[PDB]
Ligand binder design. Structure first.
Ligand SMILES: CCCCCCCCCCCCCCCCCC(=O)OC[C@H](COP(=O)([O-])OCC(O)COP(=O)([O-])OC[C@@H](COC(=O)CCCCCCCCCCCCCCCCC)OC(=O)CCCCCCCCCCCCCCCCC)OC(=O)CCCCCCCCCCCCCCCCC
Ligand SMILES: CCCCCCCCCCCCCCCCCC(=O)OC[C@H](COP(=O)([O-])OCC[N+](C)(C)C)OC(=O)CCCCCCCCCCCCCCCCC
Ligand SMILES: CCCCCCCCCCCCCCCCCC(=O)OC[C@H](COP(=O)([O-])OCC[N+](C)(C)C)OC(=O)CCCCCCCCCCCCCCCCC
Ligand SMILES: CCCCCCCCCCCCCCCCC[C@@H](O)O[C@H](CO[C@H](O)CCCCCCCCCCCCCCC)COP(=O)(O)OCC[N+](C)(C)C
Ligand SMILES: CCCCCCCCCCCCCCCCC[C@@H](O)O[C@H](CO[C@H](O)CCCCCCCCCCCCCCC)COP(=O)(O)OCC[N+](C)(C)C
Ligand SMILES: CCCCCCCC/C=C/CCCCCCCC(=O)OC[C@H](COP(=O)(O)OCCN)OC(=O)CCCCCCC/C=C/CCCCCCCC
Ligand SMILES: CCCCCCCC/C=C\CCCCCCCC(=O)OC[C@H](COP(=O)(O)OCCN)OC(=O)CCCCCCC/C=C\CCCCCCCC
Ligand SMILES: CCCCCCCC/C=C\CCCCCCCC(=O)O[C@H](COC(=O)CCCCCCC/C=C/CCCCCCCC)COP(=O)(O)OCCN
Lengths: 318, 114, 115, 98, 105, 347, 174, 83, 70
């Protein structure tokens, strides 16, 4: 039954990724006064299926200058880690119940970094190399800021267990408790997922498709699936971390509905931000976190260390 | 450097407490209040002797006290206790927080009958 | 065990997708198609040449700050101790020293990129 | 001793032999130096977790801290050498003689 | 060489961490707390030479608890003899060792 | 480098050494070693040039390898004993690893090449600090763990150091390389006496440090880094050359100077332990060190080399900066033989 | 048994053999990342989940900087892979053969090395029967860095600040 | 006070992020030493029974040690109940 | 119009319902109609093992009670 649970976690995630592609198309179109895909299917519902079939029936090519082994491994690593990030999430019951559920996600994100780096280096082209090094800088900044922000927010929780996060947010929301950390965490998650205004690893205007310039057909679709799965997973993590849903042990489907609605709201906010804002420069992104977020993050970390002690509100250990 | 001396299998036998963790957790505060004497004697023996083989009789007395406590519960408050531990067993963490009504009925039954 | 099974499932699914990608479609490769892309013109040099890194100091500072976050991570458990005053003093000491490192680098212009 | 300790000690020995045998790059030897500390971390935590030395669980973290301090030092020296010579080759570090 | 500033000033900088039988958080005992305590109390105040000469029994028990070499030798000998016996069909394991029993709670 | 940064780096080097010398925990001793190296690298790279950068790189590589081996020895010792206190090590393999690591940190042969290379690479102040302090710390660790030292390995490395220092100093013309090979030979003598009397090790350390400080400060005063550069000092300030000559005579072990006291006491102590061949070989081999000290003395003070014409302007000008404790170091390095029995106070 | 820890240890040694044969810093970093993940797995099986996750995260962050530095400082026209060069392939094969010989001898008999004696038996055998309760011993010992270990925190923070100062001074130039 | 006011006005117009960061840090350093609930947090951390309360052997001269858990002698968490 | 976006969002939401509800149903199916036991600590794991031992069917979720003690 555990393999059945793994399949029930994997396949709906991929379907939701495809329909998130469709939803982003239509939302951006309507914000841009267009309609978006509404021809392929009823209200454009077969567009993701058509795109997937076209991509996986199109010819893939390995560049003559490429290192083939790491050229093939990178999409595998990206999609594998994108699917693996979902296993500790409680909705309201995690597939894999971990005692340290957050450090696992941090480590797996830091590992998912290397997919774009190795695809850019393996492609053996200048645009791919530029995209890879932009990824390096972006990962530096967002990694330090994300680590400290998560430390503080979970210090308000008592442990690194997301079910314990639910129990903590039984009454009120971590957005009510710690909204500045929530704002900075949202920005850092945008940077982590490489979304606008921080879509610099693959910046179409500056680089011709960035790190995945040489990727085509099936391998490219895997990078796209990994990116969108990471978007949804990070928005789900944000919803669990800051917008705690009320949980009924005897009817857990209500938590699932609330969590899905909050995650969809956050993902649509991601698409809204992409439609709204221009693109950063990566030096300005590094200077944004290091020179603005990092001092405030350290001050808020000190404040959230002190606050439970001075108010006698330290959370239970277990 | 010597032969390790072990109790035989015949004097390790005792009447077991064959209730589950949920049943034990439901009647846990009442058990700790009612059978405090043998349990504390056994724990003192275990921490002083530092040897399992030296406190077997105390363990058997602990088992006897637990069996007597559960028989007293069974003779008077079988139904409220069954409802209480059935509520406790459902929770994955076996939380006392979700069963404050069945716990109230069980406490009322044991306070009046016993 | 369960985590190993999940990892194996994910890697197997990704590898199967790659295998379907590289074998299902019709293949037709020649020298011009597989040549490197530089917007229509042949690259002058090679992509394996050195690529100057203008934020080299920030990467080393990032290594040190990663150490700092590793030190700071066990704080949720450290707040369960009876020596709350000592624990609070040490946590604030570590964070103040990290802030001092950041301020020193900022004032000495280590956060600025090379020109 | 179990074979896990044997494997970790063999890994340390391999990483030490790698550092003592340069090829061309200083970066490769820096990577070999980083691996030795990884093996030390693994060995120390395996020993401490097996003996339940509770207060010793903080030692591997300090080990990692000074590990990355050494890595930072090596990277700084490598950038200075690369600025001086154009490559991180250890053959260029031959101005001083014994 | 060794300037015992800790002993002179009454400070405790690393003596808390030197041994595993000292004060541990939540009174968590070490794996070989009893053996280390016995060896330390034997060797206290007599110096290194006399400690090695005379507390060798305590030190050997301590090292045996730490590494479990003699115990592993005994277990391996028993396993090898049992495997040889079952190879020729001269030994039949009991059902409670084969998994056909109800263990104790 | 800002003066505040330089003094804080010196304070951090001294803090690392003091942490090593006061800690009772192997982890804290390793931490002190790491802090010392981390703050010592920029001191080597203070005056930036390719030679200084190369010297710092070689020093960092050597010390990092030694630290890795030292931590491996600590872990192996912990595995077989469960002890973190610095005492007699419980595993011979861990003791051998620790001995090799500390010998590499000191520069004992065959781990010596980095000593002349780095000493030539770095300036005179950096070389002085390097030699003195970076010999000060690992010798403290060795004195603490002496009772588990393998006499064969320690004496082998010590005799190798003596021979190699003598021969290298014979060949060199550069003053910094000469000082480095002298350091190698003196470290050989000290580690040779180490497995018998840590008090004699400390006595030799003190006398060597005094003589090395006097010699390095004299070189800084004369601003001479080569033999021919030192050959011009007699025409500007002949007193410094005479003081350098008597210091060189002392460093060669000639009675009745201070340099004879460590050799004499070490030979006596090793003889008390029924060692004759080793003291005789060590005494005979030091004649190479004496020879190249005498060759340096011939060029600087006992003969007059040709000079140049701008030395007249140099005559017209006067030395500004004052060396601190230079007369005291010169007196202590030549005239403390009658005060030998103070080693009991050193005990 | 299932020999999970032994298999992971073998993979750890294989990754060490790779990045020690030193094809090029890209593949050396790849091998070191693999070794870090496998060591995380080993110590997770032995009990320390926080320590495993921390070492994996720290080395993942550290190898990111190494990649950027080898792209700039330690790159050549044709970066070397294990089969590209005869020396690298020879070192890789030597390490693999030595590891395989040690594993075979250890599994077949109680292999006593010239340095240490290793017994071929269960890593599950060497474990302890006792158990903790309602807390993690590793987590409590690590969190004791602040109540205990005030001195360690002081020296560690001072070392990190001095390291920042040092890396600023080394790369100053002029 | 005029120089301090001018500096604060200039910083609040140029670096509000840094002004807020320093204010939050200063309040994090100072407030715990003044709040009367720090000792309450210490007591709550002490009152948590992680391990078993091993009983003491009664010598007949232990008047402050309860014989039963519900006896009046011993620590009381009535303060924590109403908190 | 903007409500033509909803069917895609509806499909995505329906897809996201499947993982959590499926996990809850599988946990209740494989734990005898009850929540899957959470064992974050050795005490909880030992409770589960004792439940397996006393059940007599090698399933911890098979709970026994007063009818079992007598
Ligand atoms: C948990 C993981 C545990 C792993 C344990 C083992 C690894 C330990 C660490 C690493 C040390 C050993 C590394 C392997 C060395 C193998 C020998 C060698 O030189 O290979 C060259 C090869 C590169 O050669 P190349 O330059 O690409 O080939 C060009 C040739 O000149 C000319 O080639 P060609 O043009 O003729 O092409 C023919 C062929 C060339 O095929 C190969 O080169 C085979 C490569 C696989 C090794 C086979 C033996 O190409 C193909 O078949 C195309 C498909 C390749 C994709 C599949 C690769 C599977 C890798 C597994 O190196 C590698 O493959 C390195 C990667 C090895 C590890 C793979 C897994 C990485 C996982 C990363 C994330 C980890 C997260 C968790 C931690
Ligand atoms: C390398 C991969 C193999 C080793 C990984 C570890 C496996 C054994 C784990 C045993 C312990 C365990 O189950 O712990 C449970 C724990 C979760 O529980 P926990 O840590 O909270 O505690 C255990 C549970 N209790 C509390 C009951 C004791 O698992 C983890 O923490 C996750 C560890 C993940 C380690 C990942 C290493 C990197 C692997 C990345 C692979 C990506 C694809 C690579 C290839 C791509 C290209 C082809
Ligand atoms: C390495 C992975 C191992 C595990 C694989 C697990 C299952 C994988 C499932 C995904 C499959 C992805 C492809 C989907 C189908 C579309 C492509 C396709 O049909 O490819 C097949 C390929 C197709 O060949 P192709 O190269 O022309 O592929 C292009 C196909 N079109 C035209 C559709 C684009 O078939 C072969 O390569 C073999 C054809 C017959 C020749 C047989 C030669 C002998 C060796 C194999 C037979 C067995 C020998 C036994 C004896 C051995 C000892 C002597
Ligand atoms: C939990 C959510 C799971 C995923 C849900 C996906 C939902 C997608 C939306 C589905 C809406 C489909 C509506 C039907 C669209 C096609 C209707 C019709 O117009 O097309 C037919 C074509 O249909 C195809 O022939 C067969 C049906 C395929 C279309 C239905 C697709 C159903 C969903 C696809 C699978 C989704 C998951 C994929 C994995 C007619 O073609 P045809 O008759 O020939 O033309 C000749 C007609 N003449 C003779 C009169 C001239
Ligand atoms: C001041 C001397 C200057 C000259 C020497 C300089 C040496 C470096 C500076 C050393 C200063 C610190 C020395 C004292 C260390 C105190 C260690 C410990 O004993 O005190 C702690 C008390 O700590 C205090 O809270 C203050 C600690 C110091 C705060 C930081 C000041 C040091 C700043 C150092 C700056 C960096 C310079 C260091 C490198 C040169 C313990 O409190 P306690 O709670 O009972 O411990 C609980 C243990 N239990 C559980 C077993 C009971
Ligand atoms: C959880 C969901 C959260 C939802 C929130 C979403 C917000 C809207 C999303 C749209 C934004 C996404 C794209 C924008 C990306 C860029 C964002 C951005 O620029 O913000 C950074 C912004 C830009 O700085 P500069 O203009 O460059 O000035 C530099 C001066 N030298 O600066 C910042 O860092 C803002 C940081 C916000 C942190 C919150 C401020 C804290 C307020 C202090 C009061 C709290 C004190 C706590 C103590 C209480 C004591 C009782
Ligand atoms: C039995 C063999 C089953 C398929 C093995 C395919 C391995 C192979 O040799 O092909 C390498 C092939 C690329 O070949 P090209 O050089 O681009 O040109 C040929 C295109 N068909 O690579 C792949 O298909 C990816 C292999 C799947 C990854 C699995 C690794 C885990
Ligand atoms: C001390 C207790 C707090 C502990 C630490 C605080 C948390 C961490 C904060 C430190 C992080 C680093 C700070 C770095 C400070 C100097 C950096 C710097 O160089 O700033 C300069 C100098 O600018 C300044 O104005 C210095 C900041 C002065 C702010 C300090 C004010 C102190 C406030 C005390 C409390 C006041 C309360 C007011 C409350 C108002 C409402 C909240 C500007 O940078 P630029 O180079 O111009 O930017 C790039 C341009 N191309």
């Amino acid at each position: 039954m555990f393999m059945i649970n793994i399949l029930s976690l994997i396949i709906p995630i991929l379907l939701a990724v495809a329909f998130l592609t469709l939803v982003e198309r239509k939302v951006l179109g309507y914000m841009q006064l267009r309609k978006g895909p509404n021809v392929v299917g009823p209200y454009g519902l077969l567009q993701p299926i058509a795109d997937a079939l076209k991509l996986f029936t199109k010819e893939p090519l390995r560049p003559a200058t490429s290192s083939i082994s790491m050229f093939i491994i990178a999409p595998i690593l990206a999609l594998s880690l994108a699917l693996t990030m979902w296993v500790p999430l409680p909705m309201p019951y995690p597939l894999i119940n971990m005692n340290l559920g957050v450090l696992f996600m941090l480590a797996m994100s830091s590992l998912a970094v290397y997919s774009i780096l190795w695809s850019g280096w393996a492609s053996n082209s200048k645009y791919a190399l530029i995209g890879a090094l932009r990824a390096v800088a972006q990962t530096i900044s967002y990694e330090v800021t994300l680590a400290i922000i998560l430390l503080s927010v979970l210090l308000m929780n008592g442990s690194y267990t997301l079910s314990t996060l639910i129990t903590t947010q039984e009454h009120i929301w971590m957005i009510f408790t710690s909204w500045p950390l929530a704002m900075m965490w949202f920005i850092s998650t945008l940077a982590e997922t490489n979304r606008a205004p921080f879509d610099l690893t693959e910046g179409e205007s500056e680089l011709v498709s960035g790190f995945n310039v040489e990727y085509a057909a099936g391998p490219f679709a895997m990078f796209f699936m990994a990116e969108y799965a990471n978007i949804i997973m990070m928005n789900a993590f944000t919803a669990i971390l800051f917008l705690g849903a009320s949980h009924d042990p005897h009817t857990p489907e209500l938590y699932t509905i609330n969590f899905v609605l909050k995650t969809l709201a956050l993902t649509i906010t991601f698409l809204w931000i992409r439609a709204s804002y221009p693109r950063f420069r990566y030096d300005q992104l590094m200077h944004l976190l290091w020179k603005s977020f990092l001092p405030l993050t350290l001050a808020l970390c000190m404040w959230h260390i002190s606050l439970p002690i001075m108010t006698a509100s330290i959370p239970p250990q277990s | 450097p010597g032969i390790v001396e072990l109790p035989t299998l015949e004097d390790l036998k005792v009447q077991e407490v064959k209730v589950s963790s949920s049943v034990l957790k439901a009647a846990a505060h009442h058990y700790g209040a009612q059978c405090d004497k043998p349990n504390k004697e056994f724990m003192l023996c275990r921490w002083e002797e530092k040897d399992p083989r030296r406190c077997l009789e105390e363990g058997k007395l602990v088992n006897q006290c637990a069996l007597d406590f559960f028989r007293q519960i069974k003779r008077h408050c079988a139904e409220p206790f069954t409802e209480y531990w059935t509520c406790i067993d459902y929770s994955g963490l076996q939380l006392f927080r979700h069963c404050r009504k069945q716990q109230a009925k069980f406490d009322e039954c044991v306070l009046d009958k016993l | 065990m369960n985590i190993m099974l999940t990892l194996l499932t994910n890697v197997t699914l990704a590898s199967l997708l790659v295998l379907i990608a590289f074998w299902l479609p019709q293949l037709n490769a020649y020298s011009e198609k597989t040549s490197p892309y530089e917007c229509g013109f042949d690259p002058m040099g090679s992509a394996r040449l050195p690529f100057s890194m203008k934020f080299f100091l920030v990467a080393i500072t990032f290594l040190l700050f990663d150490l700092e976050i590793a030190l700071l991570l066990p704080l949720p458990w450290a707040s369960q101790t009876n020596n709350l005053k000592t624990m609070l003093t040490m946590a604030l000491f570590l964070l103040i020293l990290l802030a001092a490192s950041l301020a020193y680098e900022w004032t000495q212009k280590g956060l600025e990129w090379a020109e | 001793m179990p074979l896990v300790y044997m494997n970790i000690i063999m890994a340390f020995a391999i990483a030490l032999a790698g550092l003592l045998m340069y090829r061309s790059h200083l970066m490769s030897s820096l990577l070999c130096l980083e691996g030795m500390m990884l093996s030390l971390f693994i060995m120390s935590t395996l020993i401490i977790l097996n003996t339940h030395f509770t207060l010793a669980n903080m030692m591997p973290i300090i080990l990692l801290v000074f590990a990355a301090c050494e890595a930072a030092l090596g990277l700084s020296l490598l950038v200075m050498v690369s600025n001086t010579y154009g490559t991180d080759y250890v053959q260029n570090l031959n101005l001083l003689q014994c | 060489p060794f300037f015992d500033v800790q002993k002179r000033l009454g400070l405790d900088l690393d003596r808390w961490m030197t041994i595993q039988s000292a004060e541990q958080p939540h009174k968590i005992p070490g794996r070989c707390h009893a053996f280390e305590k016995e060896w330390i109390e034997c060797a206290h105040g007599i110096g290194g030479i006399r400690a090695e000469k005379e507390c060798k029994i305590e030190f050997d028990d301590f090292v045996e608890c730490l590494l479990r070499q003699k115990t592993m030798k005994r277990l391996s000998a028993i396993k090898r003899q049992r495997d040889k016996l079952i190879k020729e069909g001269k030994y039949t394991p009991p059902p409670h060792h084969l998994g056909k029993e109800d263990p104790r709670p | 480098m800002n003066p505040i940064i330089y003094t804080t780096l010196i304070m951090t080097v001294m803090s690392g050494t003091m942490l090593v010398m006061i800690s009772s925990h192997w982890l804290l001793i390793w931490i002190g070693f790491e802090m010392n190296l981390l703050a010592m690298i920029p001191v080597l790279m203070k005056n930036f040039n390719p030679r200084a950068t190369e010297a710092a790189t070689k020093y960092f590589l050597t010390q990092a390898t030694a630290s890795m081996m030292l931590m491996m020895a600590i872990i192996i010792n912990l595995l077989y004993s469960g002890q973190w206190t610095i005492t007699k090590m419980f595993n011979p393999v861990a003791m051998t690893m620790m001995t090799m690591a500390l010998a590499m940190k000191l520069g004992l042969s065959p781990f010596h090449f980095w000593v002349p290379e780095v000493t030539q690479g770095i300036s005179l102040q950096a070389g002085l600090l390097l030699l003195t302090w970076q010999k000060l710390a690992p010798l403290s660790v060795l004195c603490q763990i002496s009772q588990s030292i393998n006499p064969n390995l320690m004496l082998t490395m010590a005799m190798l150091s003596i021979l190699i220092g003598g021969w290298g100093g014979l060949n060199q013309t550069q003053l910094r390389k000469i000082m480095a090979y002298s350091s190698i030979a003196h470290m050989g003598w000290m580690t040779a006496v180490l497995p018998y009397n840590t008090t004699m090790t400390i006595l030799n350390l003190l006398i060597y440090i005094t003589m090395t400080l006097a010699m390095f400060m004299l070189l800084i005063h004369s601003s001479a880094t080569t033999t021919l550069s030192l050959s011009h000092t007699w025409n500007k300030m002949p007193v410094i050359t005479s003081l350098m000559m008597v210091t060189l005579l002392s460093m060669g072990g000639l009675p009745p100077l201070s340099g004879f006291m460590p050799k004499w006491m070490i030979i006596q102590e090793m003889t008390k332990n029924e060692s004759i061949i080793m003291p005789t070989l060590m005494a005979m081999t030091a004649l190479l060190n004496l020879y190249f000290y005498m060759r340096l003395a011939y060029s600087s003070s006992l003969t007059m080399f040709p000079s140049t014409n701008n030395m007249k302007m140099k005559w017209q000008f006067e030395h500004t900066k004052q060396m601190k404790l230079l007369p005291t170091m010169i007196v202590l390095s030549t005239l403390v033989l009658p005060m030998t029995p103070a080693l009991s106070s050193l005990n | 048994t299932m020999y999970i820890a032994f298999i992971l240890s073998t993979i750890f040694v294989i990754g060490f053999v790779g990045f020690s044969s030193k094809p090029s810093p890209i593949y050396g970093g790849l091998g070191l990342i693999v070794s870090g993940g496998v060591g995380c797995g080993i110590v997770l099986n032995f009990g320390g989940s926080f320590l495993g996750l921390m070492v994996f995260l720290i080395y993942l962050g550290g190898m990111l900087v190494v990649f950027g530095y080898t792209t700039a400082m330690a790159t050549e026209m044709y970066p070397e892979v294990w089969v590209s060069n005869k020396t690298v392939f020879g070192a890789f094969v030597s390490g693999l053969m030595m590891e395989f010989c040690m594993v075979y001898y250890a599994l077949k008999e109680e292999e006593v090395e010239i340095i240490f004696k290793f017994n071929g038996l269960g890593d599950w055998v060497i474990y302890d029967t006792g158990d903790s309760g309602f807390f993690s011993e590793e987590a409590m010992g690590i969190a004791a860095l602040y109540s205990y270990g005030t001195w360690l925190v002081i020296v560690t923070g001072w070392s990190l600040l001095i390291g920042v100062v040092v890396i600023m001074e080394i790369t100053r130039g002029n | 006070a005029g120089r301090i006011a001018s500096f604060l006005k200039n910083a609040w117009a140029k670096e509000p992020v840094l002004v807020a960061s320093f204010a939050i840090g200063g309040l994090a350093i100072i407030l715990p030493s003044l709040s009367p609930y720090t000792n309450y947090a210490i007591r709550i951390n002490r009152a948590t029974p992680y391990n078993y309360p091993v009983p003491l052997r009664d010598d007949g001269n232990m008047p402050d040690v309860p014989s039963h858990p519900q006896d009046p002698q011993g620590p009381s968490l009535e303060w924590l109940k109403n908190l | 119009m903007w409500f033509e976006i909803l069917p895609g969002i509806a499909v995505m939401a329906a897809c996201l319902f499947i993982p959590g509800m499926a996990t809850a149903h599988i946990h209740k199916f494989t734990n005898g109609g009850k929540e899957k036991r959470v064992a974050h600590f050795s005490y909880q794991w030992n409770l589960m093992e004792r439940d397996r031992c006393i059940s007599g069917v090698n399933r911890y979720h098979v709970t026994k009670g007063l009818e079992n003690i007598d």
